Design a binder for this molecule. Structure first.
Ligand SMILES: Nc1ncnc2c([C@@H]3O[C@H](CO)[C@@H](O)[C@H]3O)n[nH]c12
Length: 247
């Protein structure tokens, strides 16, 4: 398992947390020095627990699928909560088995559903370590109507930070304040699957993408990425989704 404690947290200890999270994920290949995640794992190998404790020392345990870094669900005390999606109901066979209450949330973990549920777009939801503390409290004392927003903070602070060094750094920086994510952060989140696919193709195609990926940069300009010498590939993306999880 991996653990993060918010009381006494710093930029450093968040980075340590995100390094350990990445290290928890199995990979057989690296392409261009980036971990390629596995295609398929048996159930007893597929999930990892991360334990998160907020400033008030309230803890939740979050189950992630190690093949795609998706959050399956979380446990707060004696109740477990799973997303309403097939991989999450598969996971519920293996994780949090001793939990007395299990609730299935009214939505999957995909952003279009979550934003609809939250009634807020990603750009308008604060991130930063204090936002993560607040998300843990909101899920700990589960309130259906705050949950969606909190799960979006949770996913971006764990999954998305693990996938990209830029997102890890932007979040870790904000120790005692919060910030609204730019479109650069959102475009990376949107494009993880496509980038992963093209980087796998590139390795068979002399480092050239078969199809460009349009990202938005730190200056908000739409940029078209076509090969593995682009900075997003060289210096940012930290994990690759296996083409077999692209369909
Ligand atoms: N259970 C889950 N956990 C995390 N992310 C997602 C998603 C979303 O699918 C995309 C994968 O990069 C991105 O929009 C991500 O948050 N669907 N299901 C998920």
């Amino acid at each position: 398992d991996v653990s993060f404690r918010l009381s006494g947290a710093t930029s450093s200890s968040y980075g340590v947390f995100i390094s350990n999270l990445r290290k928890a994920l199995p990979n057989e290949r690296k392409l261009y020095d980036i971990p390629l995640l596995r295609s398929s794992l048996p159930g007893s190998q597929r999930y990892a627990l991360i334990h998160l404790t907020n400033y008030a020392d309230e803890t939740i345990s979050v189950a992630i699928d190690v093949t795609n870094v998706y959050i399956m669900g979380y446990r707060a005390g004696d109740t477990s909560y799973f997303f309403n999606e097939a991989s999450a109901t598969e996971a519920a066979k293996y994780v949090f088995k001793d939990a007395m209450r299990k609730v299935t949330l009214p939505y999957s973990g995909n952003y279009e559903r979550l934003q609809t549920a939250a009634g807020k777009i990603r750009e308008n939801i604060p991130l930063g370590l204090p936002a993560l503390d607040s998300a843990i409290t909101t899920l700990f004392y589960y309130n259906a109507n705050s949950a969606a927003s909190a799960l979006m903070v949770l996913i971006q602070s764990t999954s998305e930070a693990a996938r990209y060094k830029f997102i890890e750094q932007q979040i870790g920086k904000r120790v005692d304040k919060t910030f609204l994510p730019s479109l650069a952060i959102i475009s990376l989140e949107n494009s993880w699957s496509a980038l992963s696919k093209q980087i796998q193709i590139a390795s068979t195609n002399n480092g050239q993408f078969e199809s460009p990926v349009v990202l938005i940069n730190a200056q908000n300009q739409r940029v078209t990425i076509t090969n593995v010498d682009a900075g997003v590939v060289t210096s940012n993306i930290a994990l690759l989704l296996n083409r077999n999880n692209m369909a």
